[PDB]
Amino acid sequence: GSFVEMVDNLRGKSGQGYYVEMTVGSPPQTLNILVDTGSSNFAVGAAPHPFLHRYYQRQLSSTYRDLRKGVYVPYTQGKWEGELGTDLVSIPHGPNVTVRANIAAITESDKFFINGSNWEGILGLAYAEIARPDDSLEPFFDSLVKQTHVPNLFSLQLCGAGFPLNQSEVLASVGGSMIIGGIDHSLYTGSLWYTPIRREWYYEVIIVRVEINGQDLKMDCKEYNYDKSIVDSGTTNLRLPKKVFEAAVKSIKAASSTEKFPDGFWLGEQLVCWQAGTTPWNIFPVISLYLMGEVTNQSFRITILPQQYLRPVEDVATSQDDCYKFAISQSSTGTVMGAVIMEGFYVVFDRARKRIGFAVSACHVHDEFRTAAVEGPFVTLDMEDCGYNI
Ligand SMILES: CN1C(=N)NC(c2ccccc2)(c2ccccc2)C1=O
């Protein structure tokens, strides 16, 4: 492990997000910032909000520069709005550099901040193409690489605890690592396998085959990537296109048929509980996603356990039962490999070589009988046809 200063610099959990400490302005203002590979703006709370105990105070920063431009960011379940500017930014448990970066000072929001998440802003790590208002607003990572000698690569080890963390525990617990400019070999086991970044906007990838307990879902592979497949630390669940979700849920139900679960469970709305320590992991299947390899006609697979796709939640009665929600849900916007999937792996965002690496995480939750896996190669034909075109 050659990046000790950055190891264990994340906190949080899949449901509320994983965050890294950052500083903004002169003198430095410390904020906790959501690590989001699914967006491209660096945006921070800059006005009082009921869910924020701190926020960016531009009037207190001598290095603040006003860009005299507003930004309006609506998304499916809410929105944020703010004022654009630039300031000096650092990552205390990061590279030892300070950069001048764009900052959207959030002045108004709806269902953006999450009560008790402990973060006050978001770090959009994807590409300029999806930055708001447009691609002229340089993302943080682009600024960092341009201004310093930091290599154009970052890697994420998101560590799910495998059980619920209360308010005190989640603040005191290590949630993982964000390695800026490198790969830390202590964070994974086995080999790193790489899939191409199809296009630089979201971190888009191509899924070529899906299995549930080794059984091929047998859908036309274009369905798996309709209308895109992305790697997103800012999404909790593994989200699948409607038809893929319907086929996967049918297969997962069939594999786990020895126990009947309510419709609300499969809809990802309701929790299910078992007496302490009796979760029947073995009845649930493993899920393998095959990804396009770097070599022509070659693929590899990543395999997750129910310890990844069943998200630990506290019981309504804070009982001694072990409870979970089903963290696979449908999408009308393509596949999303969210935090519950990323929790199984060390994920290398190799922007320099336009590729994403996956290896079994040193912190993935498993049992004595099964582990997550990253394996290959497999001979896979016409993988280009798996990609969707509008
Ligand atoms: C799926 N997803 C995401 N990865 N980041 C969010 C986002 C952020 C900025 C602009 C559009 C979407 C997000 C993250 C945290 C809270 C709210 C929204 C979002 O909705």
Side-chain angles (χ1 to χ4, degrees), residues 34 36 38-39 73-75 80 111-112 114 119 122 232-235:
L34 177 71
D36 188 14
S39 68
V73 186
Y75 49 93
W80 66 258
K111 300 169 185 184
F112 182 72
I114 301 170
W119 52 261
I122 188 173
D232 186 12
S233 57
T235 288

Side-chain angles (χ1 to χ4, degrees), residues 162 259 272-284 306-307 310 321-324 367:
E259 270 188 53
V272 295
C273 298
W274 288 273
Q275 181 184 81
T278 72
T279 304
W281 298 113
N282 79 92
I283 79 166
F284 284 92
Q307 285 97 331
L310 300 188
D321 280 4
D322 288 342
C323 311
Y324 311 83
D367 57 43

